[PDB]
Design a binder for this molecule. Structure first.
Ligand SMILES: NC(=O)c1cc2c(N)ncnc2cc1-c1cccc(CO)c1
Length: 466
C-alpha cells in the first residue's frame, strides 16, 4: 500500500477503490488521443473515477507509449517556434503557424483571406494548434516534393531513414534547397551512412556558427538517428519530466485560494499491467508507477467549442456574469503558476449553470520567465472577455490571501513539500520557481489593486522576487 499516507480521507477512499479494482482485474484504460500516457482509472464497478498520468509516460518520459509525439511538427516547434496568430517574419511578410508565409503583400486583409482559404473557415487571423499542424504538414509535403526534384538532394533523401529525413527537411526549411546542397561532403557521407564524418563538415559552416543550438540538435540527430537531442528541453524554462508535480501543484494553488476549478489532483502510486513497463519489470510483481491522479468530471467540452457558440449566440446576462467569474478564476490560477501551455482547448466548459474545469496542468511552475513572451502566451488573453476588468467579487476573495505574507510563505512551503518528491529535485532550482511565482503574485496584487483586466494583467512586465 504505497498510498497509506495521503492527507485527504475522501481522496484516499477513491484510491482504495482503484486498488481494489486492479486486484480483481479491472485495470486503468490507456487513452489513445493524447501525446503521452494517460489512463482512465476504474472502480470495482467499472466506473471511471479518475485520470492517472505516470511520470515515466509523460510526453518526454522514457516509457511514453505514444510514439506519434516525435514528428517533424514537434521538431520544428522547438527549433522554429509556433505562433497561432498572424505575425510578420524576419523579412517583414505576414506569417502564421511555423513559418507559413501567407502573402508577400503588405495588406493585412489579404493575409486573412489567404489564411481563411488555407484553414477552410473564418479564422479572423487566429488558428488552433491542430490547424497549424495540418498547415505545417502541407508545407512538409511541398518541401519533400522539391527535395525529390533536386538532383543533389534526392539520392541522399532516399537513402536516409525516417528520423534522419526529418533532420534533412529541417535544414531545407531553415536555409532552402540551395543552402543544403552546399554541404557537399556531408551529403555524400550521409548517403554512405558515415554519420560522424558528415557531422564534422556540418559543423564547419555559417549555419553552425549563426544558429549553433539548432544546428547542434540537427547534427546530433544525423549522428544518432534518434530524437534524443529534442528530449527534456523543458521549453527552456521548465524542469523536465515533472508534469505530475505541476498537475498536483495546480490543484494545491487552487485549493488554497478556493478557486474550485481544478479537480482534486494528488501524487499517488499505482500498479497496472496496462502501463508501459520495460522488459525486465514485466518478467517479474510489477513496480508501482508514480504519477498524478485527477478526479473525473463529466459533461464538459473544449472551451473552443463553447466560445465559438457564444460569439454567434451570446449568453444571457446572468449566465455571462457567471462565466466571467469562472473565467477570472482560470486567469488567476494560470498567472500565479505561470502556465505555459493553456490553449483555448486545454480548459473545459460545461453548459452553477456554467462551470469551468482546469485540466492538463502539467506544463506550469517554470524556474524562469520565458525569454519570448510571444512563444508561450496566455491564449485566453486573446479573447474579448480578457478585457473585462476583474470583478469586485474576485478581488475581495483573492487580494486578502495573496497580500498576506504568511499565506505566500505557506504556499511556498506547501509546494516545497510536494516538489521535493521528484528524484531530480534541486534546491536552487526550486527557489528560482518560487521567485517567479512571487513575481506573478506581485503583479496580480497590483492588477487587482488597480482594477485592471486579464488583458492588462498579462501586459505587466514579468519580474522575480528574491
Ligand atoms: N487532464 C486530463 O488529461 C483530462 C482530465 C479529465 C477529467 N478530470 N475528467 C474528465 N475528463 C478528463 C479529460 C482529460 C483529457 C484532456 C485532454 C485529452 C484527453 C484525451 O483525449 C483527456
Amino acid at each position: 500500500e504505497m498510498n497509506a499516507f495521503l492527507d485527504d480521507p475522501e481522496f484516499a477512499d477513491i484510491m482504495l477503490r482503484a486498488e481494489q479494482a486492479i486486484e480483481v482485474g479491472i485495470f486503468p484504460e490507456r487513452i489513445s488521443q493524447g501525446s503521452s500516457g494517460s489512463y482512465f482509472v476504474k472502480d470495482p464497478k467499472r466506473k471511471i473515477i479518475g485520470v492517472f498520468k505516470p511520470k515515466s509516460e509523460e510526453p518526454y518520459g522514457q516509457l511514453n507509449p505514444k510514439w506519434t509525439k516525435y514528428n517533424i511538427f514537434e521538431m520544428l516547434r522547438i527549433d522554429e517556434g509556433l505562433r497561432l496568430k498572424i505575425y510578420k517574419d524576419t523579412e517583414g511578410y505576414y506569417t502564421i503557424g511555423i513559418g507559413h508565409l501567407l502573402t508577400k503583400s503588405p495588406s493585412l486583409n489579404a493575409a486573412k483571406s489567404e489564411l481563411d482559404k488555407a484553414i477552410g473557415r473564418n479564422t479572423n487571423g487566429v488558428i488552433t494548434k491542430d490547424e497549424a499542424e495540418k498547415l505545417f504538414n502541407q508545407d512538409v509535403d511541398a518541401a519533400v516534393r522539391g527535395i525529390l526534384r533536386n538532383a543533389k538532394l534526392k539520392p541522399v533523401y532516399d537513402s536516409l531513414d525516417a528520423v534522419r529525413r526529418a533532420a534533412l527537411i529541417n535544414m531545407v526549411f531553415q536555409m532552402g534547397e540551395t543552402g543544403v546542397a552546399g554541404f557537399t561532403n556531408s551529403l555524400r557521407m550521409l548517403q554512405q551512412k558515415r554519420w560522424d564524418e558528415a557531422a564534422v563538415n556540418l559543423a564547419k559552416s555559417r549555419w553552425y556558427n549563426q544558429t549553433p543550438n539548432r544546428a547542434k540538435r540537427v547534427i546530433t540527430t544525423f549522428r544518432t538517428g534518434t530524437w534524443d537531442a529534442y528530449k527534456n528541453l523543458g521549453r527552456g524554462c521548465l524542469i523536465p519530466n515533472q508534469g505530475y508535480l505541476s498537475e498536483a501543484g495546480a490543484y494545491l494553488v487552487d485549493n488554497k485560494l478556493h478557486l474550485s476549478i481544478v479537480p482534486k489532483t494528488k501524487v499517488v502510486w499505482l500498479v497496472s499491467e496496462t502501463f508501459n513497463y520495460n522488459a525486465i519489470d514485466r518478467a517479474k510483481g510489477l513496480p508501482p508507477k508514480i504519477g498524478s491522479f485527477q478526479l473525473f468530471v463529466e459533461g464538459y467540452k473544449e472551451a473552443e467549442y463553447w466560445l465559438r457558440k457564444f460569439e454567434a449566440d451570446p449568453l444571457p446576462e446572468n449566465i455571462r456574469k457567471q462565466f466571467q467569474s469562472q473565467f477570472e478564476r482560470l486567469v488567476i490560477l494560470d498567472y500565479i503558476i505561470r502556465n505555459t501551455d493553456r490553449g483555448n482547448d486545454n480548459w473545459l466548459v460545461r453548459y452553477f449553470l456554467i462551470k469551468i474545469a482546469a485540466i492538463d496542468n502539467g506544463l506550469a511552475f517554470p524556474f524562469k520567465h520565458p525569454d519570448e513572451w510571444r512563444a508561450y502566451p496566455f491564449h485566453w488573453a486573446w479573447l474579448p472577455q480578457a478585457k473585462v476588468p476583474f470583478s469586485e467579487e474576485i478581488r475581495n476573495l483573492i487580494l486578502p490571501y495573496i497580500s498576506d505574507m504568511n499565506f505566500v510563505q505557506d504556499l511556498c512551503e506547501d509546494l516545497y513539500e510536494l516538489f521535493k518528491t521528484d528524484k531530480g529535485f534541486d534546491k536552487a532550482t526550486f527557489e528560482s520557481q518560487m521567485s517567479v511565482m512571487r513575481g506573478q503574485i506581485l503583479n496580480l496584487t497590483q492588477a487587482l489593486r488597480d482594477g485592471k483586466s486579464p488583458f492588462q494583467l498579462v501586459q505587466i512586465p514579468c519580474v522575480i522576487v528574491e
